Structure formats: C-alpha cells, structure tokens
Amino acid sequence: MNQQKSLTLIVALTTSYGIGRSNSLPWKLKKEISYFKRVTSFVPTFDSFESMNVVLMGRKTWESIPLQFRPLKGRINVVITRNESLDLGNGIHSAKSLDHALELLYRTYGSESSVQINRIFVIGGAQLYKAAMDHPKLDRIMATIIYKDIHCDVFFPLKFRDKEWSSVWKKEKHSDLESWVGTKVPHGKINEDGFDYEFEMWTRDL
Ligand SMILES: NC(=O)c1ccc[n+]([C@@H]2O[C@H](COP(=O)([O-])OP(=O)(O)OC[C@H]3O[C@@H](n4cnc5c(N)ncnc54)[C@H](OP(=O)(O)O)[C@@H]3O)[C@@H](O)[C@H]2O)c1
Ligand SMILES: Nc1nc(=O)c2nc(CNc3ccc(C(=O)N[C@@H](CCC(=O)O)C(=O)O)cc3)cnc2[nH]1
Structure with missing residues (x-):
C-alpha cells in the first residue's frame, strides 16, 4: 500500500566511504556512469512494454546532475525535499519523504496507468x-568500490562493508550480480583514467 516493493540503493564510493566533494562527485568515470545508467534503466524484455524504473534522489543530488542530463531519461524521477521550495518539472515528482514518495507512485501509477513501475532505486545523497x-x-x-582515497566532504552513512555489519550485509556472487542486472558485467578490477574500481552487490534479509 505504502510500500509493497523492495528498494534498491546504488552508489559509487571509495574505500573510506567518500561519495562527494563540493556538491559534485569527485571523479570522472564514463564507463562507470554508463553502468549506473544501464542498471537504473533495465527492465526485462517482456516487462519492457509497460514498465519503467524509478530513481529517488535528495534535493542536492538533483542539482548536482548536469542540466543536459536531467531529468534522468527513461526513468521516473522523484526529488525528496522537505522544503519543496521549487519542485519544477514537466512530469517529475516531489515528495516529503521516502514513504511519501512511495505512496505518490502507488497512487499515480496504480491500475489507471499505462506505464507500470518495475524497480525503485535510491540514488542519494548521504541524507537520502x-x-x-x-x-x-x-x-x-x-x-561501485573505488580503490583510491580521493578527497571527499560527504560520506556514505553506514559502513556496510565493515566487520560490524557482516552478519547483516552480505556480498553476493558476481554471477547473481549479472543475473539481477541482466547483462554481463566486468569481473574484478577495472582501470579507467588512473582509478581502479569494482562492481559489487550486497543484500540483507528483511
Ligand atoms: N558517489 C555517488 O554514488 C553519489 C550518489 C549521490 C550523491 N553523491 C553526492 O552526494 C552529495 C549530495 O548529497 P547530500 O547529502 O549533500 O544531499 P542529498 O541527500 O542529495 O540532498 C539533501 C536534501 O535532500 C533532502 N532530503 C534528503 N533526505 C531527506 C529526508 N529523509 N526527508 C526529507 N528531505 C530529505 C533535503 O532537502 P530540502 O533541503 O529540499 O528539504 C536535504 O537538504 C553531492 O556531492 C553528490 O554528488 C554521490
Ligand atoms: N554507480 C554509481 N555511479 C554514480 O556516479 C552515481 N551517481 C549518483 C549521483 N550523481 C549523478 C550524476 C550524474 C548522473 C548522470 O548524468 N547520469 C546520466 C548519464 C550521463 C552520461 O552519459 O554522462 C544518466 O542518464 O544516468 C547521474 C547521477 C548516484 N548513484 C551513482 N551510482
């Protein structure tokens, strides 16, 4: 009703959990951002028909997206903003909280909608x-783990890869990362512009 479906978080972080610098992400990775795009927009071939995915983001991340690239295309965009000072858009929603956002979609994309909701992604930032x-x-x-201690001023709020969260968060096999993302993805380290990174999938039991 409020929330029926599971949520998925997507992030690119350093080994120190740094995620941003100056209302921007502190690196330029074309193949990396390419991955974000195909993950956040992939829906099965059959479900391909009605279904669109949703990306939920906080106000600042909204602003941090290149003008040329937003709203992020082929996805339903929703900005979380308490203030809701300016909630502009030609079809893009606003919501007071994550729960409010879930209910607006269920309400907006119920049975009286052509286009149905597939997967829901939280894309940040730190507050969201x-x-x-x-x-x-x-x-x-x-x-996406970036093996480089790049200077950041914003950090991922929970050390899910640390020993203290190891009985809750578990890293999955690559094979099931690829099955969930539905495309094959590069295994191990990847080098692009001097940075080494790797793709991972972590899951927890509800
Ligand atoms: N590396 C990555 O994958 C990645 C992913 C995302 C972001 N980032 C970076 O992280 C930074 C953006 O992060 P941030 O923490 O500063 O901001 P954020 O979460 O993007 O935006 C903060 C705003 O979002 C709203 N908000 C967030 N959670 C909310 C909640 N539970 N209820 C109500 N409002 C909520 C509030 O908006 P109002 O002020 O409108 O009320 C708050 O001011 C940038 O540097 C961005 O590049 C990196
Ligand atoms: N894995 C991952 N990498 C990221 O860089 C990332 N960034 C955010 C937040 N910031 C951003 C910034 C720009 C765009 C963006 O322009 N994406 C375009 C592709 C743009 C391009 O081709 O250069 C898109 O269409 O998704 C998205 C999210 C959230 N989760 C992430 N997750």
Whole structure:
C-alpha cells in the first residue's frame, strides 16, 4: 500500500566511504556512469512494454546532475525535499519523504496507468541514503568500490562493508550480480583514467 516493493540503493564510493566533494562527485568515470545508467534503466524484455524504473534522489543530488542530463531519461524521477521550495518539472515528482514518495507512485501509477513501475532505486545523497538504510524495505545495495582515497566532504552513512555489519550485509556472487542486472558485467578490477574500481552487490534479509 505504502510500500509493497523492495528498494534498491546504488552508489559509487571509495574505500573510506567518500561519495562527494563540493556538491559534485569527485571523479570522472564514463564507463562507470554508463553502468549506473544501464542498471537504473533495465527492465526485462517482456516487462519492457509497460514498465519503467524509478530513481529517488535528495534535493542536492538533483542539482548536482548536469542540466543536459536531467531529468534522468527513461526513468521516473522523484526529488525528496522537505522544503519543496521549487519542485519544477514537466512530469517529475516531489515528495516529503521516502514513504511519501512511495505512496505518490502507488497512487499515480496504480491500475489507471499505462506505464507500470518495475524497480525503485535510491540514488542519494548521504541524507537520502541514511533514510533508506533505515527503511524496512531496502534489501540491496549496488555499489561501485573505488580503490583510491580521493578527497571527499560527504560520506556514505553506514559502513556496510565493515566487520560490524557482516552478519547483516552480505556480498553476493558476481554471477547473481549479472543475473539481477541482466547483462554481463566486468569481473574484478577495472582501470579507467588512473582509478581502479569494482562492481559489487550486497543484500540483507528483511
Ligand atoms: N558517489 C555517488 O554514488 C553519489 C550518489 C549521490 C550523491 N553523491 C553526492 O552526494 C552529495 C549530495 O548529497 P547530500 O547529502 O549533500 O544531499 P542529498 O541527500 O542529495 O540532498 C539533501 C536534501 O535532500 C533532502 N532530503 C534528503 N533526505 C531527506 C529526508 N529523509 N526527508 C526529507 N528531505 C530529505 C533535503 O532537502 P530540502 O533541503 O529540499 O528539504 C536535504 O537538504 C553531492 O556531492 C553528490 O554528488 C554521490
Ligand atoms: N554507480 C554509481 N555511479 C554514480 O556516479 C552515481 N551517481 C549518483 C549521483 N550523481 C549523478 C550524476 C550524474 C548522473 C548522470 O548524468 N547520469 C546520466 C548519464 C550521463 C552520461 O552519459 O554522462 C544518466 O542518464 O544516468 C547521474 C547521477 C548516484 N548513484 C551513482 N551510482
């Protein structure tokens, strides 16, 4: 009703959990951002017909997206904003919280809609990530680990890859990362512009 479906978080972070610098992400990875795009927009061939995915983001991340690239295409965009100062858009929603956002979609994309909702992704930032991390429906984290201690001023709020969260969060086999993303993806380290990174999938039991 409020939330029927599971939520998925997607992030690119350093080994120190740094995610941004100056209202921007501190690196330029074309193949990396390409991955974000195919994950956040992939719906099965048959479900391909009606279905669109949803990306939920906090106000600042909204602003941090290149003007040329937003709203993020082929996805339903929703910005979480308490203030709701300006909630502009030609078909893009606003919502007071994560729960409010879930209910607006269920309401907007019910049976009286052509286009049905497939998967829901939280794309950040840190404040929205903190809220998702405490949501009873978030069970999966699509993370990109960047093996470089790049200077950041914003951090991922929970050390899910640390020993203290190891009985809760588990890293999945690559084979099931590829099955969930539905495309094959590069295994192990990837080098692009001097940075080494890797794709991972973590899951927790609800
Ligand atoms: N590396 C990555 O994968 C990645 C992914 C996303 C973001 N980032 C980076 O992280 C930074 C953006 O992060 P951020 O923490 O500063 O901001 P954020 O979460 O993007 O936006 C903060 C705004 O979002 C709203 N908000 C967030 N959670 C909310 C909740 N539970 N209830 C109500 N409103 C909520 C509030 O909006 P109002 O002020 O409108 O009320 C708050 O001011 C940028 O540097 C961005 O590049 C990196
Ligand atoms: N894995 C991952 N990498 C990221 O860079 C990332 N970034 C955010 C937040 N910031 C951003 C910034 C820009 C665009 C963006 O323009 N994406 C375009 C592709 C743009 C391009 O081809 O250069 C899109 O269409 O998704 C998305 C999210 C959230 N989760 C992430 N997750």
